Amino acid sequence: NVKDLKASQRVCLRSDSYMLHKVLENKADPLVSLMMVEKVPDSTYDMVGG
Amino acid sequence: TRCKLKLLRMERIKDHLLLEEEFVSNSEILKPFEKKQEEEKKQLEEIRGNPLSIGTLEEIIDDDHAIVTSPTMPDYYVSILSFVDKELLEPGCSVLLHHKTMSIVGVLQDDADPMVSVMKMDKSPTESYSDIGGLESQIQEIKESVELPLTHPELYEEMGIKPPKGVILYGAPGTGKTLLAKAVANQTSATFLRIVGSELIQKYLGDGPRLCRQIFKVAGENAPSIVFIDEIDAIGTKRYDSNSGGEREIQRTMLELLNQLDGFDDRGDVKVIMATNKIETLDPALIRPGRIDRKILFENPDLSTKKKILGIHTSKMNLSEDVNLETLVTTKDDLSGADIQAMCTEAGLLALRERRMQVTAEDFKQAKERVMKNKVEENLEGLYL
Amino acid sequence: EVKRIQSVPLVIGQFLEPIDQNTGIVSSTTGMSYVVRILSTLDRELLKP
Amino acid sequence: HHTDCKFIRVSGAELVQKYIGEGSRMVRELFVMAREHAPSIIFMDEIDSIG
Amino acid sequence: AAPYAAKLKQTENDLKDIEARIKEKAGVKESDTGLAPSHLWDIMGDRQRLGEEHPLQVARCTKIIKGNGESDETTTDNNNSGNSNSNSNQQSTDADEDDEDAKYVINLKQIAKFVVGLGERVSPTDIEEGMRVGVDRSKYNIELPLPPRIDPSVTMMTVEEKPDVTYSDVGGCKDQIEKLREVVELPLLSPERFATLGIDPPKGILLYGPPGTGKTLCARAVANRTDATFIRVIGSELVQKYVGEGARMVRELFEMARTKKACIIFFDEIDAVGGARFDDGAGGDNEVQRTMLELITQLDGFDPRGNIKVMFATNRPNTLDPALLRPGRIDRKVEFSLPDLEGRANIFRIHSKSMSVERGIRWELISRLCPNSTGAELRSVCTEAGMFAIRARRKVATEKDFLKAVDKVISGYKKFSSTSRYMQYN
Numbered sequence: 031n032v033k034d035l036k037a038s039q040r041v042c043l044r045s046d047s048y049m050l051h052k053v054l055e056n057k058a059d060p061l062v063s064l065m066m067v068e069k070v071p072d073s074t075y076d077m078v079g080g
Numbered sequence: 081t082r083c084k085l086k087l088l089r090m091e092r093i094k095d096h097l098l099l100e101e102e103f104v105s106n107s108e109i110l111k112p113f114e115k116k117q118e119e120e121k122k123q124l125e126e127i128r129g130n131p132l133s134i135g136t137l138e139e140i141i142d143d144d145h146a147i148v149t150s151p152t153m154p155d156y157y158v159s160i161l162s163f164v165d166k167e168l169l170e171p172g173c174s175v176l177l178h179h180k181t182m183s184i185v186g187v188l189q190d191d192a193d194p195m196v197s198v199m200k201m202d203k204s205p206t207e208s209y210s211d212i213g214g215l216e217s218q219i220q221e222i223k224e225s226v227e228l229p230l231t232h233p234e235l236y237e238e239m240g241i242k243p244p245k246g247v248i249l250y251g252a253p254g255t256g257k258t259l260l261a262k263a264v265a266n267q268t269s270a271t272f273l274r275i276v277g278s279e280l281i282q283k284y285l286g287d288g289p290r291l292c293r294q295i296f297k298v299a300g301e302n303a304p305s306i307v308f309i310d311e312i313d314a315i316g317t318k319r320y321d322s323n324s325g326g327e328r329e330i331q332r333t334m335l336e337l338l339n340q341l342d343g344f345d346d347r348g349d350v351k352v353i354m355a356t357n358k359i360e361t362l363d364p365a366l367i368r369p370g371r372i373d374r375k376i377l378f379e380n381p382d383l384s385t386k387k388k389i390l391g392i393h394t395s396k397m398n399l400s401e402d403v404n405l406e407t408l409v410t411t412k413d414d415l416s417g418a419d420i421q422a423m424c425t426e427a428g429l430l431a432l433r434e435r436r437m438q439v440t441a442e443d444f445k446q447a448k449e450r451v452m453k454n455k456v457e458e459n460l461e462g463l464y465l
Numbered sequence: 466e467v468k469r470i471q472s473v474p475l476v477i478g479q480f481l482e483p484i485d486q487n488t489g490i491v492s493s494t495t496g497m498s499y500v501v502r503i504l505s506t507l508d509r510e511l512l513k514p
Numbered sequence: 515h516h517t518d519c520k521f522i523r524v525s526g527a528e529l530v531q532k533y534i535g536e537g538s539r540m541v542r543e544l545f546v547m548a549r550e551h552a553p554s555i556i557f558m559d560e561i562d563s564i565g
Numbered sequence: 566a567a568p569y570a571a572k573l574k575q576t577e578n579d580l581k582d583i584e585a586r587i588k589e590k591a592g593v594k595e596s597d598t599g600l601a602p603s604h605l606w607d608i609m610g611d612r613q614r615l616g617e618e619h620p621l622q623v624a625r626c627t628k629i630i631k632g633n634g635e636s637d638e639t640t641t642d643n644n645n646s647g648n649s650n651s652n653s654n655q656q657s658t659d660a661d662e663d664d665e666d667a668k669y670v671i672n673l674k675q676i677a678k679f680v681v682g683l684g685e686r687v688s689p690t691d692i693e694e695g696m697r698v699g700v701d702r703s704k705y706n707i708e709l710p711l712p713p714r715i716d717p718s719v720t721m722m723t724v725e726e727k728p729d730v731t732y733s734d735v736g737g738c739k740d741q742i743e744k745l746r747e748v749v750e751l752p753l754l755s756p757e758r759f760a761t762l763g764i765d766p767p768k769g770i771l772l773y774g775p776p777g778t779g780k781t782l783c784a785r786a787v788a789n790r791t792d793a794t795f796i797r798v799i800g801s802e803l804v805q806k807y808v809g810e811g812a813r814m815v816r817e818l819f820e821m822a823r824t825k826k827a828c829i830i831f832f833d834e835i836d837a838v839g840g841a842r843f844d845d846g847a848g849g850d851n852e853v854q855r856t857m858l859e860l861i862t863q864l865d866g867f868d869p870r871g872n873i874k875v876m877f878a879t880n881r882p883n884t885l886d887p888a889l890l891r892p893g894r895i896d897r898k899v900e901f902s903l904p905d906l907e908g909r910a911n912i913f914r915i916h917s918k919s920m921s922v923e924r925g926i927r928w929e930l931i932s933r934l935c936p937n938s939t940g941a942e943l944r945s946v947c948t949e950a951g952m953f954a955i956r957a958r959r960k961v962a963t964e965k966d967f968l969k970a971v972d973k974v975i976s977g978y979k980k981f982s983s984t985s986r987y988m989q990y991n
């Protein structure tokens with residue numbers, strides 16, 4: 031419904047009418063994909079002691 | 081304890097009722113009608129296909145057609161037809177087109193665009209009627225120009241003068257020029273436009289002059305208004321790039337801004353605010369006096385002004401019995417209002433450092449010396465001595 | 466029959482990231498985001514980056 | 515790593531990513547991303563060998 | 566921590582309730598677009614939408630060909646051109662004859678060029694260069710001509726005829742104003758004297774100067790005095806220029822003045838549009854250069870002008886072409902400059918005239934204290950003095966109220982150099 035779609039909601043669409051599919055919370059941008067490249071933070075304070 | 085309960089007494093019952101009221105009413109609206117309006121709606125939906133390609137109306141030719149420029153590369157002579165009027169449209173307004181054969185099938189936009197969305201804000205102002213002290217005088221100059229025509233237009237008519245248009249806040253960083261404008265806007269209860277001047281500019285060309293138009297267009301629909309175009313410096317005299325990809329963009333965008341500010345008429349009903357670092361990051365003539373009244377130079381708090389800023393902060397933190405109000409001022413030398421707030425954040429971190437629940441004497445003293453050390457010069461007294 | 470589809474012509478795109486374990490989102494070298502069904506008989510552990 | 519915060523790390527000046535949009539507006543989107551996925555630490559780089 | 570702790574969670578739930586309340590509200594808005602007088606528009610609305618009759622693409626002619634002599638058959642012909650009226654009527658070794666002319670080559674607003682035919686409504690006298698023409702969705706062919714460019718209706722706004730400005734609304738009876746009279750009025754009244762002397766009568770003028778002098782006020786002033794109708798174009802307000810759109814902006818208004826008699830063509834603010842080209846620059850534009858090339862030739866052509874005068878205001882003479890700066894386009898040059906004491910007295914008297922203030926004030930007294938200044942700054946002293954006056958709750962601004970207003974603008978000047986002087990005791 032239009033009570034189930036919100037402002038600033040990303041959504042999927044077809045291409046032969048652009049008819050909606052469903053809601054998506056994965057927002058795809060080059061900055062968000064930069065987090066995928068970087069991977070997880072590492073190390074610990076005693077590795078970088080001194 | 082008793083009065084925060086009183087805020088709860090007012091807000092919980094009235095607010096909670098309001099959600100519930102909306103929710104039943106959405107059903108209730110439907111039930112009064114069962115023909116006529118339903119019928120007309122039904123045939124609007126048969127007529128208007130799915131999807132609808134957006135248009136932008138350039139102009140109306142009076143004969144039941146018009147010309148639109150659309151995000152589809154070629155332009156169209158479209159017709160005005162079906163549940164739309166010739167006078168339900170105005171030029172430059174956004175229209176809805178029919179996918180198959182472009183026709184204006186009505187409007188449900190009326191200047192609805194994303195740049196409009198960034199610009200309008202439903203947020204709460206940070207300051208309300210100068211919550212934080214200092215700069216008492218400078219606000220009684222913004223207010224004369226901006227707030228005062230809106231509140232009482234009559235007084236200017238006895239005087240026989242035209243009423244001011246706009247203000248320019250400029251000079252020092254950390255003095256809360258961007259926050260005084262927010263204060264003034266809450267005091268009146270005006271429409272505030274946080275657009276930023278830097279949010280019209282992108283690498284891609286030719287988009288920008290549309291955006292400049294849209295600001296003045298929306299501001300006039302919801303007038304009275306206060307428009308704040310914050311950080312109009314970046315779009316100043318300067319250039320994007322020294323190679324390519326931006327030789328045009330700054331040049332078109334600025335010029336286009338001056339034009340529709342003047343072209344309204346010389347109004348005292350839509351004010352503008354230009355927030356800028358200096359006039360040395362902009363062009364040497366703007367648009368250029370008699371028309372842009374008044375200019376406000378921010379400079380550093382003096383001993384009176386910086387006392388006032390400080391008293392606000394210190395009272396919201398534990399103790400003040402330990403080190404006198406005066407003793408903080410004395411130790412400090414004259415600086416912007418950010419440096420005064422900075423000493424108090426550092427003081428609080430120092431109480432954490434000790435693991436106290438009081439801001440002790442020791443904490444105040446260190447926090448004062450720290451800020452002074454950033455931010456330092458000593459050749460004022462070295463030339464001298 | 467599948468194998469025919471796999472052979473040329475193909476258009477380059479770039480895989481970004483999954484949204485499911487069988488549908489992903491790419492953006493092409495055309496300059497268009499397309500949400501695409503991923504084919505079985507390929508990596509989905511070394512496909513993720 | 516210890517705070518249990520986002521990372522990113524932004525390497526240098528932003529213009530470089532264009533795969534969708536431009537890098538000028540990824541600064542605007544710094545807000546949107548930081549907030550949704552809060553708690554965040556952002557290690558914003560720019561050494562300033564620009565001078 | 567029970568007094569604040571418990572009350573903190575209670576605060577929080579209310580805010581979240583309010584956020585949720587706004588998403589319930591915005592999912593339903595006000596019904597619909599349905600209006601009883603446009604429900605009758607629906608009868609015609611079904612038929613046209615389903616039919617092949619709209620949209621028409623907007624195209625515009627960009628190149629004219631003559632449809633014989635074009636070189637369409639290429640069998641026994643040579644070059645890219647034929648005899649310029651025949652190509653298939655003098656020979657049937659091509660094996661074809663055709664009698665189609667004025668075929669025309671359009672450009673779409675997608676930047677794709679096509680040759681098209683002519684409809685049943687079109688003849689070669691309904692089409693021209695630069696005129697919008699509507700063509701099909703699919704296979705193209707002109708159906709109905711649309712008027713030239715996007716210029717009409719937008720230009721007419723900028724044009725005001727017969728100004729409500731005289732040399733009372735201009736202060737100072739300046740040097741430039743005395744040389745201005747000679748250009749418009751003197752050869753209009755009597756072209757006899759100019760002829761006999763053997764000078765060719767002044768009709769070009771370029772008003773230029775720093776901002777805020779009021780170069781425009783004068784120009785308006787004399788337009789009314791000479792009693793000539795006034796035609797204004799502003800080339801930094803009107804920014805249509807794309808592929809010789811601004812040459813069509815120029816042509817219309819010049820062309821209109823030419824049909825009339827006793828006219829003023831005022832070309833204003835041509836720093837951009839019909840101004841300096843940016844080929845040399847990093848801008849790469851030569852779209853303003855079409856506007857330039859047209860403007861020159863319109864002037865030159867008009868000559869002898871029959872006592873219809875072409876005027877120019879441009880801020881800088883650095884944004885002009887040196888062909889304009891040859892005589893027969895511009896003949897007279899006036900730099901507007903800071904008014905004298907009494908000239909600044911006069912601009913103060915007009916500002917003050919509109920005000921409802923105490924009359925015991927003397928205009929000369931205020932302007933003494935004032936330095937050399939622009940008119941726009943003296944507009945600022947009166948508007949500032951008005952604001953001080955209501956604030957103190959006087960319905961009049963005394964002589965003293967204007968001295969405070971003067972002083973604040975000056976104090977700013979002192980802030981940017983160094984304050985304190987020897988004039989605190991001298």
Ligand SMILES: Nc1ncnc2c1ncn2[C@@H]1O[C@H](COP(=O)(O)OP(=O)(O)OP(=O)(O)O)[C@@H](O)[C@H]1O
Pocket residue numbers: 207210212213214215216252253254255256257258259260389416417418421
């Ligand atoms: N009159 C005042 N109104 C608001 N805050 C003030 C006032 N005077 C001083 N302050 C202090 O100044 C501080 C700094 O304000 P802020 O950093 O937002 O500055 P700004 O001049 O708008 O800056 P920028 O150049 O960074 O856009 C406030 O947090 C407050 O402590």
Ligand SMILES: Nc1ncnc2c1ncn2[C@@H]1O[C@H](COP(=O)(O)OP(=O)(O)OP(=O)(O)O)[C@@H](O)[C@H]1O
Pocket residue numbers: 370734735736737775776777778779780781782880911912915940941942944
């Ligand atoms: N000669 C004057 N008499 C009275 N007021 C004047 C005079 N000159 C300028 N002003 C004041 O300055 C205001 C703005 O300047 P004006 O429009 O006259 O100037 P300009 O130098 O021709 O401008 P632009 O660079 O904007 O084309 C006028 O509306 C008027 O109030």
Ligand SMILES: [Mg+2]
Pocket residue numbers: 257258
């Ligand atoms: Mg600021």
Ligand SMILES: [Mg+2]
Pocket residue numbers: 780781
């Ligand atoms: Mg002017």
